[PDB]
Write a protein that binds this DNA or RNA. Structure first.
Ligand code: CA
Ligand code: CA
Ligand code: CA
Ligand code: CA
Ligand code: CA
Ligand code: CA
Ligand code: CA
Ligand code: CA
Ligand code: CA
Ligand code: CA
Ligand code: CA
Ligand code: CA
Ligand code: CA
Ligand code: CA
Length: 92
RNA sequence: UCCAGUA
RNA sequence: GGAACACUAUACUACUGGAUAAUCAAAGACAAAUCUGCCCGAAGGGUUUGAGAACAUACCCAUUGCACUCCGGGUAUGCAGAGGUGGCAGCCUCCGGUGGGUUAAAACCCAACGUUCUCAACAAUAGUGA
């Protein structure tokens, strides 16, 4: 079910944390306001990224019209955040 | 291993 | 450069180039100034080497992973960052290599950035100067 944050995995693991951040924000800006974007290259949190929007309609729209997107020769796998992000929890 | 210049 | 004021010589370290005649050339960052705030100490000043650890960058193995506190493993690499008396933050200047601006081209300018901590060793000798 719809949520401000979207979970993206199947991301090219060879990509630097800085480059990936700026690239993600770029392809997801046309969808709405981006409060933040979490990326880690840990053992557990790599190949993935959380991307938070300010509006749920933005996220819902981003998921739908970006699924399987060829992001670094690897078709994205977007999904809704199972849980809510801290940024949003401590707010409303 | 010596010699110069430089640092 | 030369390591706890400062300078010089020597041993010595590094860059670059040479063969007793040891060439020319190349190579070279501590130059200028000594800032602001806060904070810790009995005292603030390391152009040395090493060892751990962390971090970064190449590959290699493993990982398809729901986080929001950094944090898989392995091989190689790191030997350029500097000054402003400790630390954190900011600012000024320098050196370096990227990316912009301006030019006929430079030169000038703008911006972002550049390996850190811990332990251990070493910090000589000769001379000079408060
Ligand atoms: Ca010098
Ligand atoms: Ca000297
Ligand atoms: Ca000395
Ligand atoms: Ca000098
Ligand atoms: Ca000076
Ligand atoms: Ca005192
Ligand atoms: Ca110093
Ligand atoms: Ca690694
Ligand atoms: Ca290593
Ligand atoms: Ca370096
Ligand atoms: Ca410059
Ligand atoms: Ca110029
Ligand atoms: Ca800055
Ligand atoms: Ca100590």
């Amino acid at each position: 079910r719809p949520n401000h944050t979207i979970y993206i995995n199947n991301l090219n693991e060879k990509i630097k944390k800085d480059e990936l951040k700026k690239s993600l924000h770029a392809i997801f800006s046309r969808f709405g306001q981006i409060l933040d974007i979490l990326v880690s290259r840990s053992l557990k949190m790599r190949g993935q990224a959380f991307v938070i929007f300010k509006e749920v309609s933005s996220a819902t729209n981003a998921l739908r019209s970006m699924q399987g997107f060829p992001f670094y020769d690897k078709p994205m796998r977007i999904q809704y955040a199972k849980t809510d992000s801290d940024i949003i929890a401590k707010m409303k």
